[PDB]
Amino acid sequence: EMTIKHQLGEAKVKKNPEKVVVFDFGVLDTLDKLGVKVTALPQMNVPKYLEKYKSSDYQNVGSLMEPDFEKLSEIKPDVIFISGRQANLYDKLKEIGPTVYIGIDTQHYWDSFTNNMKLIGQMFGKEKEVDEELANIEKQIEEVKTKAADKKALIILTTGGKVSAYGKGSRFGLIHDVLGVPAADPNLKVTNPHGQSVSFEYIAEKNPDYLFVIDRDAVVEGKPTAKQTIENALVKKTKAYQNGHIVYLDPNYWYLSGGGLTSVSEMIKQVEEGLK
């Protein structure tokens, strides 16, 4: 048995749990990377890169925000992994089975990710494999930091033709904090998961060298809006647009997932491609 201290409390889990339930897609992609058998997940909306798990091979335990608590009672999980989207449901889930919070601390992204991945390693007897995969991600980080130098960036999320911004220490702060991309707005302190609502005027005025764009609507709705939103008078005149430095980050990772061995690796590859 393992005793796990996390941001929301403490859990007790058998090592090598057989019936694994996952509500965080970063953890799901970690288990997939390590070849750990998964029992169930919310299949209402699954990231494209994880569509293996949209299959009938797996039990459907609802949506990210609305678990199927009955179907969970029918499984009786050895462990339930949750992150931010389910934090408000910590107490209800804890009633059904061992429940581990495994979101990232955005103020300490690398250390929190490392801790989270090492817990997974310990739990499934995959300790050294995780240690090596973390090192391989670090090799990506050290290279990208050099390409990132001197390139002022802004991070935006688009939905419905409108935008929010994120900077240092935010949900998407790893672009600045981990990958060493300078912030076009250093005084932008954001903790809203949905970003700070901003205008196109704000983006134009900040006039970033690079604009990282995360299209919510591509994943939540099935209709891309990011290129339409960006194709706008105030953005089209930015350095970022004129220099071909609008970087459409894949929202299947950035919006729906993050914090896993595969997603963090792929997220860094997407940044690096954008900086190249």
Author numbering: 25 to 300
Article, verbatim:
Siderophore-binding proteins from two thermophilic bacteria, Geobacillus stearothermophilus and Parageobacillus thermoglucosidasius, were identified from a search of sequence databases, cloned and overexpressed. They are homologues of the well characterized protein CjCeuE from Campylobacter jejuni. The proteins have a two-domain structure, with the domains linked by a long α-helix at the base of the fold. The siderophore binding sites sit between the two domains.
